[PDB]
């Protein structure tokens, strides 16, 4: 009975791994977006821009 | 992200170079006109001129 109980443990571990995989994909896209906004903030930091570019 | 962020810095430096180039062209024109004024001032400083040429 104890040996047969391991299947639920394996299912729970695989479920956690899938959840972390989905979170990792979301984190990848979020870091891409974060880098792009840092580029935008540096570009807008310049005082030689006109109003429209800002 | 830090490496990819350098494009904004490059663009800002290029914009500064373009602004300085425009300023230097206008300054070249202004110095040419200033030399012309100095020539006219020396010409008009002569006391033998009649009122018309002055």
Curated annotation (Swiss-Prot), chains A, B:
Taxonomy, superkingdom: Bacteria
Function: Flagellin is the subunit protein which polymerizes to form the filaments of bacterial flagella.
Entire-sequence positions represented here: 57 to 110 of 273
Subcellular location: Secreted; Bacterial flagellum
Protein known as: Flagellin FljK
Family under the similarity heading: Belongs to the bacterial flagellin family.
Assembly information from the UniProt record: In C.crescentus, the flagellar filament is composed of multiple flagellins of 29 kDa; 27 kDa and 25 kDa.
């Amino acid at each position: 009975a104890t040996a047969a109980s391991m299947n639920a443990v394996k299912d729970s571990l695989q479920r956690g791994q899938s959840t972390i995989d989905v979170a990792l994909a979301a984190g990848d896209t979020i870091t891409d977006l974060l880098g792009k906004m840092k580029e935008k903030a540096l570009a807008a930091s310049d005082t030689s821009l006109n109003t429209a570019s800002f």
